[PDB]
DNA sequence: GAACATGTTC
DNA sequence: GAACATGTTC
């Protein structure tokens, strides 16, 4: 349990996590690499994630975002904000979410922020909301308060976002995961990363 | 007093601040440019600074103190970037306050002073007579934050303000020079000295 | 955004 | 130490 399972498992309900493709326009804040199942996002800059459910789940069902290290070695390490930002004045003050946590859900007040005493694991749970009428997808806002190169945070260590569809009980109804990249230039990094990996 | 004066003023005694030249072998933990009166130093890697003196009324002591080179930022107080101030790697092991950028390695008689009115951080040590056969006294120094350290002096150059002053704390000597805690003190000075030439 | 700065890898 | 990684200046 302390190491959570990256492994995708879309539940009985179709569990789809989709990033509505950013505006094509030049200034991206979060481009997502379909090919790399990787998300390059600017820091503390809201990026939204869509979730598609083929069939409705029993109520109280909810979604848990959780960051973790890709590097097997680090998986053991807990994902947390870099102290330097953890106390940082600039955002702690706007947002009620605990400083430590990396993943902030933006725009929900039922958002529950979690530390697993057993695993000392950061996460943030929100209760599933019916996709807007005439709308396919329940969209969510996620804020990352640490760069991927944030030293004393996950310096230099890639991470995975584990979004799970869970019962109140906690039974896993479906999970999807992808690489994250909080950087300064999610654009450049994506292209270099794409050319860098694809051209290989 | 809030903005300490960069200006050099060797006094009655000849205040000699000098870095005995580094090995000249390829590896450079630290280097000091005499052209730019700038010192390049790897982080937290001990760097030795000596001083050559007229003997000075006892209790005289010497204080290092960092200040931003950029006028705009002289007002700001140089301090360890949180993410280091917290940092386990060295904050444990040494007895000096994490806040502090400059650490003196050799002494236990060193005092790390956080001014209440200015709020500035510096370390004061008492002058020791150069050891016999030694022309001058030599003080270890430790910088616990890269010159490019976020939440500290993340991008902004600094000057080390060294001064020898009496127990009264009056100013007897003073010299300052720019510092740059980097990861590659060598390439930097060559880049910077190279740059300046052209 | 391209030029630059600056830490890290192999 | 060269070549890569990555926030930052203008
Ligand atoms: Zn951070
Ligand atoms: Zn630091």
Residue numbers in the entry:
A (entry chain A): 113 to 312
B (entry chain B): 113 to 165, 167 to 311
Show me the paper's own sentences about this structure.
The p53 family of transcription factors is composed of the proteins p53, p63 and p73 (1–3) that share an N-terminal transactivation domain (TA), a central sequence-specific DNA-binding domain (DBD) and an oligomerization domain (OD) within the C-terminal domain. The p53-family response element (RE) has a loose consensus which, based largely on in vitro binding studies, consists of two decameric ½-sites separated by a short spacer (n): RRRCWWGYYY-(n)-RRRCWWGYYY (R = purine; W = A/T; Y = pyrimidine; n = 0–13, although for the majority of validated REs have n < 3). The crystal structures of all the members of the p53 family show that the DNA-recognition residues are conserved across the family.
The configuration of the protein–DNA tetramer complex is consistent with the C2 molecular symmetry found in the structures of the WT DBDs of the three members of the p53 family. As mentioned, the overall structure of the WT and S139F mutant is alike with a root mean square deviation (r.m.s. dev.) between the α carbons of the WT p73 DBD and the S139F mutant of only 1.15. However, loop L1 in the S139F mutant is moved further away from the base pairs in comparison with loop L1 in WT p73 DBD. In both monomers A (D) and B (C), the Phe139 residue in the p73 DBD S139F mutant is rotated away from the DNA molecule owing to the hydrophobic repulsion between the charged phosphate in the DNA backbone and the aromatic phenylalanine ring. As a result of loop S7-S8 movement towards the adjacent monomer, the total buried tetramerization interface increases from 979 Å2 in the WT tetramer to 1188 Å2 for the mutant S139F tetramer. Our main structural observation is that the mutation S139F increases the flexibility of loop L1, together with more subtle structural rearrangements in the N-terminus and the loops S3-S4 and S7-S8. The observation that p73 S139F DBD has a much higher Kd than the WT p73 for the GAACA ½-site RE correlates with the destabilization of loop L1 in the crystal structure of the mutant with the GAACA RE.
